[PDB]
Amino acid sequence: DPLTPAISDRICKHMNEDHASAIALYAQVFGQQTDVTMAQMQAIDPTGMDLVVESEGGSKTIRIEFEQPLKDSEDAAQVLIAMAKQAASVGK
Amino acid sequence: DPLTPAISDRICKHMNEDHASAIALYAQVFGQQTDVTMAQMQAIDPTGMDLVVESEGGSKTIRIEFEQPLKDSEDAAQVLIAMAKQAASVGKNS
Amino acid sequence: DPLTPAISDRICKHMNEDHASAIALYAQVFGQQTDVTMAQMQAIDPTGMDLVVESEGGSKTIRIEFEQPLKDSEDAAQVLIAMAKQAASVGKNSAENL
Amino acid sequence: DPLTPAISDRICKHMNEDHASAIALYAQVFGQQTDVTMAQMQAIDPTGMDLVVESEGGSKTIRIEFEQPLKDSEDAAQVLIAMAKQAASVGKNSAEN
Amino acid sequence: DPLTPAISDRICKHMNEDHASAIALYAQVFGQQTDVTMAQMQAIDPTGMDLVVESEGGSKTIRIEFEQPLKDSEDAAQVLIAMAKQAASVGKNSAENL
Amino acid sequence: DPLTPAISDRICKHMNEDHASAIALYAQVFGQQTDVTMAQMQAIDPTGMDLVVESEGGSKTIRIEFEQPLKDSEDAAQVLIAMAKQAASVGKNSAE
Amino acid sequence: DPLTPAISDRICKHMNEDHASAIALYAQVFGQQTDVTMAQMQAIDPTGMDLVVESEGGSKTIRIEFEQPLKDSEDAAQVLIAMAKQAASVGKNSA
Amino acid sequence: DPLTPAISDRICKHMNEDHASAIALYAQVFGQQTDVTMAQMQAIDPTGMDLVVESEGGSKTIRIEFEQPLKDSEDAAQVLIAMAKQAASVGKNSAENLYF
Ligand code: HEB
Ligand code: HEB
Ligand code: HEB
Ligand code: HEB
């Protein structure tokens, strides 16, 4: 159940390097952003994640909270996977 | 996270729990297997991974090798995702 | 040239004599046959093509459908070339009985 | 499809869009040209084909002849596909300054 | 006779005096040289070869790194023989100008 | 050597000079003619051939069509040889 | 029609893909080879033809000559057709 | 380089392993042997070489002598290369049994 600054940043690097498309979906679907360009996961915490978005407003940073609290990095991956699939359906 | 049986255990249990569909795709496309009732992941290593496509009353021990060897845990996740994408594409054009 | 049953006969003839290896790949990767042996393109259609695969089971006549429909003879070659390349990548991550 | 000037137009069109990479291989291996920018198949004949590699000081108007003469459009492609495989092998064992 | 710098000098002598024509073929085929007046073999290394081409531009030292690495002096002769034969096939398709 | 009107003349002349007997068999078996004295090949098309026969009636211009269409001169020769062999077999197993 | 090395390749093809039994009959009744297992026509020239009976000891490269000279490809066909007839006659004989 | 038992074994080996065709040529042309099956270079000497041809009826040990004596291993290669081109030339002009 370890969610530290280091744990968060490796998780955010994997997402920013292997699943950058999903981060864009998070900002558009969950963060009601339209012109998503270079969406990045800045940090993730047991409660939510912080997304640096580059949209019409500019280079701002938003926060998306997870309904069920996260305990460990695995709970993060499962939630991120589920949110991306659910977000993929709304966008279509 | 470098090559170590313990790190491989967590990875094959994460895939066996979160991406069991991908394991099934591996057995059908790469393993040339037709009757996949329950495809499982027994082990992984830089050369290749070892899959077990069993059945209600059967078992298949198979080995799938990665073209380019894997060094750490994040490269294993990059190869697996890409392999699932390649297998997901084959299922479409058939 | 627009897709025609006569044009298909010409395409299948070229494939069986100049690119017979690809036909074998198509039936392993897209037809999921294990044994390879000889491989023949019996006919091609705007929706898909029919292959006669000699396999572990034996003489089988299977059909492989193209995701995007084919319009002319040129699209046939382009799809055939692309499908063979995709099979070449899968074949490179081959398997073996442990 | 017996060799005719009209057939050549079709073949050169197919090669310049679907197999332009092979045309590049032809010019370097068989044409002995090093600076390859845009390799094109202008025309093909039963004796040979004319490739164009536009470069500094004018387009490389060059002629590569097929050792054994071609009869139909199928015979042309058979020759081409084999010339490109010989070009893929040679290019692998390439040289450099 | 595993590859060594002394062994390379020996090999380059045999090729440079008994198979000097083949050296020209190497430079033309593999080194994409067109005019050849005197082709020479400076040195051979486990993975490659250094050639002096005295033609076309002029003084010109090129290197043909073999796609297959060598193990001994025998691999050099076998590789050199095979490369010359393969180069002979390209020579059969003459390249000219319009 | 794809079938062309110039190629047809070349094939028909060869057939009329080296295999005139076979042309007679075609008219009897495939053209169902009886008393053939001289048989000649006029033209060969991708789909069929024209035969000039002298039978029980007078000079007759008949047409014999090949079940499978012919593409080149080689298919013509192979088809002609097989058709002559089939006619040669009927004469062996035929009576009247 | 004019007998050229290119024409010979065309002629040998016809007699080797079709009427292949004719080539073997030739090197048996005109040629003096007894064990014929793969008779092949390598080349046709004006004076004769280079028959090759690939065998255990060696490809029996053997030459048969045409008493009457050949003029064009047509004379070749006429000469070949007639030679196969004397071969269906000498090959199948009584005792 | 200089004439030695091992020098002969490695030249005859290089020949039995890389140029077995040339050994076959040397026998047909120079040794007047015909219908050769397995031609081999048993030994090479400054004066000549000993070739072992295998024939349908009986094996053969023939000797082909070099007009000008060989001094070192390099002279051996240069002599064989020449004899092989000569035999190739004689190979192009092939005879056959005539019939009518
Ligand atoms: C977006 C969402 C998502 C998705 C969709 C995915 C999808 C995926 N994936 Fe993932 N992952 C993830 C998210 C994800 N993912 C995460 C978050 C993680 C974690 C990371 C870290 O921790 O850093 C992972 C992780 C991971 C891993 C590792 C594990 C260990 O290390 O133990 C692997 C192998 C994978 C695979 C995979 C695959 C094959 C796929 C396809 C099916 N993955
Ligand atoms: C498999 C796949 C494939 C491949 C790999 C190929 C490869 C090739 N290719 Fe190919 N193609 C093809 C498929 C193909 N292909 C097709 C399908 C076609 C069409 C045919 C018909 O139409 O018939 C062609 C066709 C063709 C042509 C045309 C001919 C005529 O016109 O008739 C040419 C020229 C060529 C070339 C070529 C080359 C050079 C190569 C190498 C790179 N192609
Ligand atoms: C180009 C390529 C090539 C070729 C073609 C050849 C071809 C030949 N070859 Fe040689 N080789 C060679 C490259 C060569 N080669 C080399 C590299 C060697 C080695 C050298 C040294 O080691 O130094 C030899 C080596 C050799 C030897 C040895 C020597 C000693 O031991 O010292 C001999 C004998 C010979 C012969 C010969 C012949 C007979 C022939 C046929 C013509 N070669
Ligand atoms: C009827 C059917 C038939 C038959 C049976 C035959 C049979 C025969 N055949 Fe014959 N062919 C023919 C039909 C035929 N065929 C044709 C169609 C041709 C083509 C012609 C033209 O193109 O003109 C020939 C062609 C021919 C040739 C070529 C010539 C030139 O180039 O000009 C020769 C060599 C011959 C041989 C022969 C022989 C040896 C025989 C056996 C006796 N053919």
GROMACS .gro file of C-alpha atoms and ligand atoms in nm, chain A residues 6-15 18-23 26 41 44 73-85, chain B residues 1 7-15 18-23 26 41 44 72-85, ligand 1:
model
  108
    6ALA     CA    1   0.866   0.864  -0.566
    7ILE     CA    2   0.587   0.602  -0.619
    8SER     CA    3   0.360   0.876  -0.766
    9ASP     CA    4   0.626   1.009  -1.005
   10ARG     CA    5   0.722   0.666  -1.145
   11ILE     CA    6   0.347   0.597  -1.197
   12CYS     CA    7   0.308   0.940  -1.362
   13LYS     CA    8   0.612   0.877  -1.582
   14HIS     CA    9   0.473   0.545  -1.705
   15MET     CA   10   0.142   0.716  -1.778
   18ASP     CA   11   0.324   0.475  -2.218
   19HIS     CA   12  -0.038   0.594  -2.186
   20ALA     CA   13  -0.026   0.966  -2.270
   21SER     CA   14  -0.343   0.928  -2.479
   22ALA     CA   15  -0.544   0.822  -2.174
   23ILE     CA   16  -0.429   1.129  -1.981
   26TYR     CA   17  -0.906   1.210  -1.857
   41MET     CA   18  -0.006   1.354  -1.515
   44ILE     CA   19  -0.121   1.116  -0.816
   73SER     CA   20  -0.001   0.159  -0.684
   74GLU     CA   21  -0.210  -0.135  -0.806
   75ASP     CA   22  -0.532   0.038  -0.703
   76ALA     CA   23  -0.402   0.331  -0.917
   77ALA     CA   24  -0.345   0.119  -1.227
   78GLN     CA   25  -0.686  -0.048  -1.201
   79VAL     CA   26  -0.858   0.288  -1.156
   80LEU     CA   27  -0.664   0.447  -1.442
   81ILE     CA   28  -0.744   0.154  -1.670
   82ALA     CA   29  -1.113   0.168  -1.579
   83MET     CA   30  -1.139   0.546  -1.616
   84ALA     CA   31  -0.978   0.538  -1.961
   85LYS     CA   32  -1.216   0.268  -2.088
   93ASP     CA   33   1.322  -0.348  -1.145
   99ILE     CA   34   0.957  -0.925  -0.973
  100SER     CA   35   0.834  -1.171  -1.246
  101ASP     CA   36   0.579  -1.321  -0.998
  102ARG     CA   37   0.413  -0.979  -0.938
  103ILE     CA   38   0.407  -0.901  -1.317
  104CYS     CA   39   0.252  -1.238  -1.422
  105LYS     CA   40  -0.006  -1.207  -1.136
  106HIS     CA   41  -0.089  -0.844  -1.238
  107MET     CA   42  -0.143  -0.956  -1.602
  110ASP     CA   43  -0.592  -0.727  -1.484
  111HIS     CA   44  -0.522  -0.829  -1.845
  112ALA     CA   45  -0.628  -1.193  -1.872
  113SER     CA   46  -0.779  -1.106  -2.211
  114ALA     CA   47  -0.434  -1.008  -2.339
  115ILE     CA   48  -0.296  -1.343  -2.223
  118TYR     CA   49  -0.111  -1.410  -2.699
  133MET     CA   50   0.081  -1.670  -1.749
  136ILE     CA   51   0.837  -1.415  -1.786
  164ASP     CA   52   1.373  -0.414  -1.683
  165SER     CA   53   1.006  -0.423  -1.577
  166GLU     CA   54   0.889  -0.119  -1.781
  167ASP     CA   55   1.028  -0.269  -2.108
  168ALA     CA   56   0.835  -0.590  -2.036
  169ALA     CA   57   0.516  -0.374  -2.009
  170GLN     CA   58   0.602  -0.194  -2.334
  171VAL     CA   59   0.652  -0.527  -2.519
  172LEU     CA   60   0.336  -0.681  -2.374
  173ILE     CA   61   0.113  -0.382  -2.458
  174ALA     CA   62   0.251  -0.364  -2.811
  175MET     CA   63   0.213  -0.740  -2.855
  176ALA     CA   64  -0.149  -0.715  -2.740
  177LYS     CA   65  -0.204  -0.432  -2.989
  771HEB     C1   66  -0.438   0.379  -1.885
  771HEB     C2   67  -0.447   0.272  -1.805
  771HEB     C3   68  -0.371   0.147  -1.842
  771HEB     C4   69  -0.400   0.063  -1.946
  771HEB     C5   70  -0.511   0.073  -2.048
  771HEB     C6   71  -0.299  -0.041  -1.939
  771HEB     C7   72  -0.293  -0.144  -2.029
  771HEB     C8   73  -0.197  -0.243  -2.028
  771HEB     N1   74  -0.094  -0.259  -1.942
  771HEB    FE1   75  -0.057  -0.137  -1.787
  771HEB     N2   76  -0.022  -0.010  -1.625
  771HEB     C9   77  -0.093   0.103  -1.594
  771HEB    C10   78  -0.200   0.159  -1.662
  771HEB    C11   79  -0.257   0.097  -1.772
  771HEB     N3   80  -0.217  -0.016  -1.836
  771HEB    C12   81  -0.036   0.160  -1.474
  771HEB    C13   82  -0.078   0.285  -1.401
  771HEB    C14   83   0.067   0.076  -1.437
  771HEB    C15   84   0.156   0.097  -1.316
  771HEB    C16   85   0.277   0.188  -1.351
  771HEB    C17   86   0.373   0.212  -1.234
  771HEB     O1   87   0.343   0.165  -1.122
  771HEB     O2   88   0.468   0.292  -1.253
  771HEB    C18   89   0.075  -0.030  -1.534
  771HEB    C19   90   0.169  -0.133  -1.529
  771HEB    C20   91   0.179  -0.235  -1.622
  771HEB    C21   92   0.280  -0.340  -1.619
  771HEB    C22   93   0.390  -0.359  -1.515
  771HEB    C23   94   0.353  -0.441  -1.388
  771HEB    C24   95   0.470  -0.464  -1.290
  771HEB     O3   96   0.574  -0.399  -1.308
  771HEB     O4   97   0.452  -0.539  -1.192
  771HEB    C25   98   0.258  -0.422  -1.727
  771HEB    C26   99   0.339  -0.545  -1.764
  771HEB    C27  100   0.144  -0.366  -1.798
  771HEB    C28  101   0.092  -0.420  -1.915
  771HEB    C29  102  -0.022  -0.369  -1.976
  771HEB    C30  103  -0.082  -0.428  -2.093
  771HEB    C31  104  -0.033  -0.552  -2.164
  771HEB    C32  105  -0.191  -0.349  -2.125
  771HEB    C33  106  -0.286  -0.370  -2.241
  771HEB    C34  107  -0.410  -0.456  -2.209
  771HEB     N4  108   0.102  -0.256  -1.731
   0.00000   0.00000   0.00000
